[PDB]
Design a protein around this ligand. Structure first.
Ligand SMILES: Cc1cn([C@H]2C[C@H](O)[C@@H](COP(=O)(O)OP(=O)(O)OP(=O)(O)O)O2)c(=O)[nH]c1=O
Ligand code: SF4
Ligand SMILES: [Zn+2]
Lengths: 763, 249, 66, 251
DNA sequence: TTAAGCAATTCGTAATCATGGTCATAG
DNA sequence: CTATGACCATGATTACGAATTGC
C-alpha cells in the first residue's frame, strides 16, 4: 500500500476542514493539503491508525471501501507484523475482524459482502446505497459521476520515478477521495436516512443491512403496547398463491384524438383504511354465530371473509398507514415549491421512498415466507381493487353519451389496475381537460373516504402497442403547451439492449410524434442501417450488458454473459465478474450459428485484439423487430415492405494467420479494376481525373476536422495543456473514438499519395 | 459489353456449389484473359483462388475490364433452376449493375433470369509462388472419407509425409488412429518428397474443402515448412481451383 | 543490462526535457540538445552500442492504447 | 495375448449395429471357445447371448480367459470408419487395458489401427433355462421385419396365437383391430412352423422392432416360444456361431 | 438465523417433426 | 443399365427458462 488520502468535514459547513495525504516516498508540496512521507510501510499504517484515533470521526464513507479497502489494509498489516494497527474502534481493548455476510430478496436480488467491525462508528459505502436505491446501466464511479455530475501498471512506474510524478499521483488520489463526499451531500442521502430512522423507529445501521420487515415489525409493536396485545408466532411452509390484479383488454393502435387519464391515488393503503381491515379485527367464520347482527357491525368481501365495522374496533394497520400517508403528504407539500430540476427529482425520490414503505406494509401480509402472514387480507384487497376498476369503466362509458345531452359517447381504450384511459372524442385539449376534470370529480363521489379518483394528464397523440407497452405526449395545462414524451415499457427504457437501438427508437418517436413526418423517419432509419453496414458506427453503441445472478439458474441453461464471465483471461485470474454485478460484451462474427454464446467477447479485448463485428446479427436480431413493432400500426403490411425495401435499396452497400501473407493488389479509384502498376486511375477512366481528385479531398478535409476536435478535448478533461493524456476510461465515448480517426486519417492520407505531389519540397 | 457462352453448365454448377457455404459475398474480376477470383472466407482463416481461362469458354466477348459484386446465395439459388445438360450464356452491360443468365436446353425450352448486383468495398489479396517440398497426388474419394472418418474422434489432424508414403493421424476422447498410404493410373497415390513433413490442421476447414469433390478425380496436396497447406484441383481445359489453409503453431 | 534499463526509464520521466510519449527516444534526445537544455552524455552512449531493439529505442508506454 | 482375425468381417459391423440401440454396455467374455457375450437389457425385459466359436474364425491366439467390458456406441462409432469388405483384426494385451483394432483393406493399401480404452464392469449375470419350446418357426428375416413393421403402424403391443395350420399375429390400435395369418409353405425363403400344442401369448412389438435390427444377420430367422417363457429369436451367424435374443414375456 | 407482493412480455437454446438428395441394389 | 424406397442431411415448430419492467 503506497498512498492513503483523507478528507474530513463537520456537517453543515459548505467546505471541508481537513485534507491530508500520506505517501511512501518523498514527495512535492500541494497547496491546500498537508503532505508527510515515510521510508517504510509500517510507519504509514501506524500514522493512519493514530490519525484515525485522534480525529475520532462519527461517520466513515468512501466508494467500495467494504469489499476492497479495509480488508486489504487489515491483511497487509497482518503480513508485516505490526501489532497495533487493527484497533480502529472506540473501545480501547478491542481488535477488528473480517466476516462474510449475504443478503437476498426478490426486490434487489442477492449480494455477498464482507463486514469489518467498528464499535461506536458508522459506515456508509456509497456503492451499496447506489446499488440498493437506483437502477442504472453501469455502476462505476466514472459512470455515476457522469450521470449525476458530468465527467494499475502505469501507477507502478509513476511511483518508481521522481517526486513530481508522485505529486501527480497524490492529486489524482485526492480527487478520487473527494468525489463521494460531493455525491453524499448533493443527493440528500444522509438527511433522508435520518428522516427514515425517525419515522420508522429503527437504528441507523439497519438501513444498510436489512430489508423492509424490521421496520413494519417495529411500528406494529410500537402501536401494540398502547392497547395491550401480544403478537403470536405463526409459521407455515407453505401456502398457495392468490389472484392478483386485472388488466383491461386494449383497443390497440395509433390514436390522434385526445385520451384523458383518470386514476386512484394511494389505492391499496386506502382500501385497507376505509373498510377497517386488520389482523386484530378479522372475524373467524364461526364467531359471528350465533349472534345475528350483520348490519353495521360487519361487512363482507368478494373473496368471502367477514370483517367488523369500525363502531366496535379500530385496527392497527389503518393507524400505521395513516401516519405514513401524512409523512408523504408533507414531503410532497415541500416538493411543490422547488425550482431546481435535480433538487425536484431528489425530493421526488424522498416521496417515492415513503410511498414504497406504505405499500410494503400491505405486502407484508401476503408473504408466506416471513414473520406473520394473513393471506385472507391480501385476497380481500385485490378483490376490492378489481371491483372498483370495473365500476370505474362501466360508469365512465355509461354516463357521457349522445342521448344524455353530451357530444359523443366515450369509449375506454385501456385500464391497468389503478388507471383508466378514456377517449372522449373532442380534438381540443381544453375541452378534453374540462370534461376529464368533471369526470374524475364526478366518479369520486361513490365511495368511502379517503378514496378519490383524480385527473392526471391528456395524451395527444397516443400509441398503444400491447399490454404494458405504450407511448404518448404529455399535457399538464393548456398554456403550458407540452412537457415531454412518455415511453412506458418500450425499447428505450430497458437495459437489455444496445444504445444504438434505444437511440433509434427515441429518435423515431421524436420525428414521428412531434414533427409528424414519416419520410424523415424512414430516411433516418435508412441512414442508421446504411452506416451500420458501411462500418462507421462506434463500438460504444454496440455494447450489451447483463446481470450475473445466482450461479445455479445460470447452470440450468447456457447464456452468453455467463460464458464470458466464467471464461477467465490469461492476464488476470483475479479480476473477473462476481455474483450480482453486470457483465458487458459485444458479439463478433463467426460461423457457429447454433450458438450466440460462442461469439461473445469483452469490449477491451476486442479493442486490443481487433476482432470484426457481426453486422447481420445486429441487423436482423437487435434492430429489426422493435422497428416492426413501432412502424406497422400507422400503415398496413406495405409498411413492413417499405422498411424492408428501404433496407433493400441500402442493403446493397456493404464495406469489407493467413492475414500476414498479403499481396496488396492496387485498384482503380474509378471502376475498381485490379491492375499492374501504382497509378490511381484506370486507362479507360483517366480523363475524369480532376473530378476524381476533387472527390475524396473533401473527405480528407472532414477527417482532419474530426482529429482536432477530439484530441484537444482530452486536454481539457484532463486539466493540463503541457503534459501527456493517460485516460483509458471504458465508460467514455472519447476513448476508442479517438483511436479510430488516427487510422482513418492514416488510410485516407496514403490514398492521395497515389496522385503525385503538388510541388517540390527541397528548394 | 460482356457476353460469354459455355456448353457445359455442369462445370458452372459444381464450382458454385464449391463455395456457397464458405463465402457469402464476392467480386468477379472480368477481364480479357478469363474470369478470375480471389477471396477470403468469412472466418478470416482460408483463401480461395479460382481461374476459368478465356479459351475454354466456347463463345467469349469482353470489351472492357469489369468488376461485378455478387451475393453468392442468390446466384446459387438461380443456378439450380437449370438442368445438368443445358448450355449457359452470361450477358452483362458495361454501364449496369444487373446480370443476365440464359439457359438453353439441348432439345423447345429456353430460360432467362436477371439478377441485381451490389457494390462492395472489399480488398483483393493473393499468393507468392514458392516450391512446396511435399507433393501428394491422391484420389479425392479416399481423402473425403479419411477426413470425414477422423472427424468424429477429435478436431485436429496431423499430416506425416515420409519417404514411401504419407500417414494421417488423429486423436480424441474415444481414442486415436492413423491411416498410411504408400508409393506403388488415377487411383495411385504419387508421392514426391525432398524433406519430410509433419504438421497439424483443424478438421472443419478440411471438411469444407472436400465439398467440391465432383469437379475431378484426383486432388493435389502441397506442403512445406511452416507455410499454409495448399489444396489444388484442376478443371479440364478450363482452369483450376485452390484453397489455402495455415498450420497451427 | 538491468541497470541500463533504469537509466532510460529515468530519462523518460524527467519533466525538463519534454512531454514525450508520442515519439522515439533518440528524437527527444536530439530535440533537447538543439535547444540545449542539458541532455546527459550517457543516455546517448547506450543508444549507440545497440541495434534497433524495441526495448531500448522506444518510449515506456509505446504499447498502451493511449 | 489375444490376437484374432476375421476376413468376411462385415458381420461385426452388423452385430454392433443391432446391439447399440438396445443396450449401452457389454460384458465381453473371451474364452478359448471364442468370443461370447451374455448381457441383460436396460429395461429388465430382455437379454443378448452372442456366441462366436473359434472354428468360425480364421487365425487365433487366445492365452487368457479375458472378461472385459465395452461401451458399445463409441465402439460402433469407431466401427463406422471401416468398410464391409475390409478385414477386421483384434489385438489385446492382458495387462494393457485397451483394444487395438486393425482394419486391413482387401486391396491392402488403406491400413487402419484404432484404439479404444477400457472401463470396469460389475454386470449382473443370470442363466437361461433350457426347456421345450412349443413353437419353433423358421422364417425369412426380411419378411419378418416387414410384417412386424407393418404392425407397428397399428398399435404398440402384439398378441400371438401359435397353432397347427396357421400362425396368427394380431394387434389392436387407435384405428381398430387387425391380424395377419401365416402358414407353412409346401432353404432360405422356406418357412416352417413346428408345433406340438397351440398357445397364445402377449409380447411387445417395439422389442420386435429392436430384435429385427439383426435382419441382415443370417440366412433365416428362428422364433422359439412356449408357455409363459422368454421368446428366443435366433440369428444363425453363418459358419461362425449364433446370436440369440431373449425376451421375458408379458403379463 | 434471514428474506414486501403479482401480471406480463420478450428472446435464445435444445428438442421434435417435415422434407429432399444421394445411393444401393434388385429387375 | 435402370426404378424403388431406405438412408443421411438440413430446415420449420413447439416448449420452457431467464431477464426485466409495470402496477
Ligand atoms: C408500485 C407498486 C404498486 N402497488 C400496488 C399498490 C398500489 O395501491 C397500486 C397502485 O400502484 P401505484 O400507482 O404505482 O402507487 P399508488 O397508487 O399507491 O400511489 P400514487 O398514485 O400516488 O403514485 O399498486 C404495490 O403493491 N407495490 C408496488 O411496488
Ligand atoms: S478519453 Fe478523453 S474525453 Fe474521454 S474520459 Fe478520457 S480524458 Fe476524458
Ligand atoms: Zn478504371
Amino acid at each position: 500500500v503506497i498512498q492513503i488520502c483523507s478528507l474530513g468535514l463537520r456537517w453543515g459547513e459548505p467546505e471541508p476542514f481537513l485534507r491530508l495525504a500520506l505517501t511512501l516516498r518523498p514527495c512535492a508540496p500541494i497547496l491546500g493539503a498537508k503532505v508527510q512521507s515515510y521510508e517504510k510501510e509500517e510507519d504509514l499504517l501506524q500514522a493512519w491508525s493514530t490519525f484515525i484515533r485522534i480525529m475520532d470521526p462519527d461517520v466513515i464513507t468512501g466508494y467500495n471501501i467494504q469489499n476492497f479497502d479495509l480488508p486489504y489494509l487489515i491483511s497487509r498489516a497482518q503480513t508485516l507484523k505490526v501489532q497495533t494497527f487493527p484497533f480502529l474502534g472506540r473501545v480501547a481493548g478491542l481488535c477488528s475482524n473480517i466476516r462474510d455476510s449475504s443478503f437476498q430478496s426478490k426486490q434487489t436480488g442477492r449480494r455477498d459482502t464482507k463486514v469489518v467491525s467498528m464499535v461506536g462508528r458508522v459506515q456508509m459505502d456509497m456503492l451499496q446505497v447506489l446499488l440498493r436505491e437506483y437502477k442504472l446501466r453501469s455502476y462505476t464511479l466514472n459512470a455515476v459521476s457522469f450521470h449525476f455530475l458530468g465527467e494499475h501498471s502505469i501507477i507502478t512506474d509513476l511511483q518508481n520515478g521522481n517526486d513530481q510524478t508522485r505529486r501527480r499521483l497524490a492529486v489524482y488520489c485526492l480527487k478520487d477521495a473527494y468525489l463521494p463526499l460531493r455525491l453524499l451531500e448533493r443527493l440528500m442521502v444522509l438527511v433522508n436516512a435520518v428522516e427514515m430512522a425517525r419515522v420508522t423507529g429503527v437504528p441507523l445501521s439497519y438501513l444498510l443491512s436489512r430489508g423492509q420487515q424490521v421496520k413494519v415489525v417495529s411500528q406494529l409493536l410500537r402501536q401494540a403496547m398502547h392497547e395491550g396485545l401480544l403478537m403470536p408466532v405463526v409459521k407455515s411452509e407453505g401456502g398457495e398463491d392468490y389472484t392478483g390484479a386485472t388488466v383491461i383488454e386494449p383497443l390497440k393502435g395509433y390514436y390522434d384524438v385526445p385520451i384523458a387519464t383518470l386514476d386512484f391515488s394511494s389505492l391499496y393503503p386506502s382500501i385497507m383504511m376505509a373498510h377497517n381491515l386488520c389482523y386484530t379485527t378479522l372475524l373467524r367464520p364461526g364467531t359471528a354465530q350465533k349472534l345475528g347482527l350483520t348490519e353495521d357491525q360487519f361487512i363482507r368481501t368478494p373473496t368471502g371473509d367477514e370483517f367488523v365495522k369500525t363502531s366496535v374496533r379500530k385496527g392497527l394497520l389503518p393507524q400505521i398507514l395513516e401516519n405514513l400517508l401524512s409523512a408523504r403528504k408533507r414531503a410532497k407539500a415541500e416538493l411543490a415549491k422547488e425550482t431546481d430540476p435535480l433538487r425536484r427529482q431528489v425530493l421526488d425520490g424522498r416521496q417515492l421512498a415513503l410511498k414504497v414503505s406504505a405499500n410494503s406494509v400491505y405486502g407484508f401480509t401476503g408473504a408466506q415466507v416471513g414473520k406473520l402472514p394473513c393471506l385472507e387480507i391480501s385476497q380481500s384487497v385485490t378483490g376490492f381493487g378489481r371491483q372498483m376498476i370495473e365500476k370505474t369503466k362501466q360508469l365512465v362509458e355509461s354516463k357521457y353519451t349522445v342521448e344524455n345531452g353530451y357530444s359523443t359517447s366515450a369509449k375506454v381504450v385501456y385500464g391497468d389496475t389503478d388507471s383508466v384511459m378514456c377517449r372522449f372524442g373532442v380534438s381540443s385539449v381544453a375541452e378534453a381537460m374540462a370534461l376529464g376534470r368533471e369526470a374524475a370529480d364526478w366518479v369520486s363521489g361513490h365511495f368511502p373516504s379517503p378514496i378519490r379518483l383524480e385527473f392526471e394528464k391528456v395524451y395527444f397523440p397516443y400509441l398503444l402497442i400491447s399490454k404494458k407497452r405504450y407511448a404518448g405526449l404529455l399535457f399538464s395545462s393548456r398554456p403550458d403547451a407540452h412537457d415531454r414524451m412518455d415511453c412506458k415499457g418500450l425499447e428505450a427504457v430497458r437495459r437489455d439492449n444496445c444504445p444504438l437501438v434505444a437511440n433509434l427508437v427515441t429518435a423515431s418517436l421524436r420525428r414521428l410524434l412531434i414533427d409528424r413526418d414519416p419520410e424523415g423517419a424512414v430516411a433516418h432509419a435508412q441512414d442508421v442501417i446504411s452506416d451500420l453496414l458501411c462500418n462507421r458506427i462506434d463500438i460504444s453503441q454496440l455494447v450489451i450488458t447483463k446481470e450475473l445472478t445466482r450461479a445455479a439458474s445460470d447452470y440450468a441453461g447456457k447464456q452468453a454473459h455467463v460464458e464470458l464471465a466464467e471464461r477467465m483471461r490469461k492476464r488476470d485470474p483475479g479480476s473477473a465478474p462476481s455474483l450480482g454485478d453486470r457483465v458487458p460484451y459485444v458479439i463478433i462474427s463467426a460461423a457457429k450459428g447454433v450458438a450466440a454464446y460462442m461469439k461473445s467477447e469483452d469490449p477491451l479485448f476486442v479493442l486490443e485484439h481487433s476482432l470484426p463485428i457481426d453486422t447481420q446479427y445486429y441487423l436482423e436480431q437487435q434492430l429489426a423487430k422493435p422497428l416492426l413493432r413501432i412502424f406497422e400500426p400507422i400503415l398496413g403490411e406495405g409498411r413492413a415492405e417499405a422498411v424492408l425495401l428501404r433496407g433493400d435499396h441500402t442493403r446493397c452497400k456493404t464495406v469489407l494467420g493467413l492475414l500476414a501473407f498479403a499481396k496488396r493488389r492496387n485498384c482503380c479509384i474509378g471502376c475498381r479494376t485490379v491492375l499492374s502498376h501504382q497509378g490511381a486511375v484506370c486507362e479507360f477512366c483517366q480523363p475524369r481525373e480532376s473530378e476524381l481528385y476533387q472527390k475524396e479531398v473533401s473527405h480528407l478535409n472532414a477527417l482532419e476536422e474530426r482529429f482536432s476536435r477530439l484530441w484537444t478535448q482530452c486536454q481539457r478533461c484532463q486539466g493540463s495543456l503541457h503534459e501527456d493524456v493517460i485516460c483509458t476510461s471504458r465508460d467514455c465515448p472519447i476513448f476508442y473514438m479517438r483511436k479510430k480517426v488516427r487510422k482513418d486519417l492514416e488510410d485516407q492520407e496514403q490514398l492521395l499519395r497515389r496522385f503525385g505531389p503538388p510541388g517540390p519540397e527541397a528548394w | 459489353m460482356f457476353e460469354a457462352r459455355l456448353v457445359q453448365g455442369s462445370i458452372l454448377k459444381k464450382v458454385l456449389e464449391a463455395l456457397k457455404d464458405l463465402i457469402n459475398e464476392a467480386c468477379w474480376d472480368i477481364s480479357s484473359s478469363g474470369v478470375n477470383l480471389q477471396s477470403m472466407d468469412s472466418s478470416h482463416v482460408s483463401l480461395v483462388q479460382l481461374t476459368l481461362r478465356s479459351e475454354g469458354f466456347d463463345t467469349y466477348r469482353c470489351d472492357r475490364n469489369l468488376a461485378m459484386g455478387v451475393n453468392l446465395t442468390s446466384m446459387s439459388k438461380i443456378l439450380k433452376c437449370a438442368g445438368n445438360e443445358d448450355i449457359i450464356t452470361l450477358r452483362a452491360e458495361d454501364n449496369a449493375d444487373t446480370l443476365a443468365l440464359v439457359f438453353e436446353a439441348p432439345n423447345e425450352k429456353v430460360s432467362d433470369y436477371e439478377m441485381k448486383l451490389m457494390d462492395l468495398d472489399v480488398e483483393q489479396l493473393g499468393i507468392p509462388e514458392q516450391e512446396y517440398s511435399c507433393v501428394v497426388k491422391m484420389p479425392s474419394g479416399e481423402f473425403a472419407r479419411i477426413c470425414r472418418d477422423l472427424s468424429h474422434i477429435g478436431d485436429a489432424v496431423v499430416i506425416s509425409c515420409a519417404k514411401d508414403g504419407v500417414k494421417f493421424s488423429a486423436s480424441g476422447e474415444l481414442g486415436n488412429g492413423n491411416i498410411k498410404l504408400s508409393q506403388t493410373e488415377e487411383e495411385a497415390v504419387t508421392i514426391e518428397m525432398n524433406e519430410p513433413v509433419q504438421l497439424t490442421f483443424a478438421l472443419r476447414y478440411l471438411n469444407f474443402f472436400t465439398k467440391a469433390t465432383p469437379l475431378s478425380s484426383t486432388v493435389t496436396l502441397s506442403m512445406s515448412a511452416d507455410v499454409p497447406l495448399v489444396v489444388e484441383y484442376k478443371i479440364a481445359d478450363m482452369g483450376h481451383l485452390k484453397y489455402y489453409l495455415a498450420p497451427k503453431i | 543490462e538491468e541497470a541500463e534499463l533504469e537509466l532510460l526509464r529515468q530519462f523518460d520521466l524527467a519533466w525538463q526535457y519534454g512531454p514525450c510519449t508520442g515519439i522515439t527516444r533518440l528524437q527527444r534526445w536530439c530535440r533537447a540538445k538543439q535547444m540545449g537544455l542539458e541532455p546527459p552524455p550517457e543516455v546517448w552512449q547506450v543508444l549507440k552500442t545497440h541495434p534497433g531493439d524495441p526495448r531500448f529505442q522506444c518510449s515506456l508506454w509505446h504499447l498502451y492504447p493511449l
